Design a protein around this ligand. Structure first.
Ligand SMILES: *[C@@H]1O[C@H](CO)[C@@H](O[C@@H]2O[C@H](CO)[C@@H](O)[C@H](O)[C@H]2NC(C)=O)[C@H](O)[C@H]1NC(C)=O
Ligand SMILES: *[C@@H]1O[C@H](CO)[C@@H](O)[C@H](O)[C@H]1NC(C)=O
Lengths: 50, 50
């Protein structure tokens, strides 16, 4: 318990500004006027884009 | 007000009046319907499974 340790703390803030940091993911094209499930910067759902 | 009481006096009307009033009563309300899955889970399916 008395030996030294090393600490690294990572702090995240949620999406309020445009996203800058995130992992690898390929992006497809935009499809509209069709029921489809989407993913915009990490938020999921299902609907129609217009 | 104070009407005068007497043991040898009476009052009798000599003219009438035709009156029309109005009465309002509710009868029915709005018929609604709810969908549990759409209201609670929305588009998710794991929530429906739970
Ligand atoms: C009973 O009441 C009616 C209603 O007010 C009287 O009729 C009115 O009489 C006056 C006076 O002659 C007229 O100016 C009106 O035009 C009449 N009609 C209305 C709708 O007011 C009637 O005269 C009364 N009866 C008695 C015996 O007094
Ligand atoms: C009637 O009324 C008068 C006055 O209120 C009262 O003096 C009398 O006793 C009553 N009865 C009769 C029968 O007059």
């Amino acid at each position: 318990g008395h030996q030294p340790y090393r600490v690294v703390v990572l702090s995240f803030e949620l999406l309020h500004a445009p996203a800058t940091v995130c992992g690898p993911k390929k992006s497809t094209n935009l499809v509209k006027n069709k029921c489809v499930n989407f993913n915009f910067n990490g938020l999921t759902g299902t609907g129609v884009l217009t | 007000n104070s009407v005068a009481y007497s043991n040898n006096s009476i009052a009798i009307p000599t003219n009438f009046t035709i009156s029309v009033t109005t009465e309002i009563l509710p009868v029915s309300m709005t018929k609604t319907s709810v969908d549990c899955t759409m209201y609670i889970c929305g588009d998710s399916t794991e929530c429906s499974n739970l």
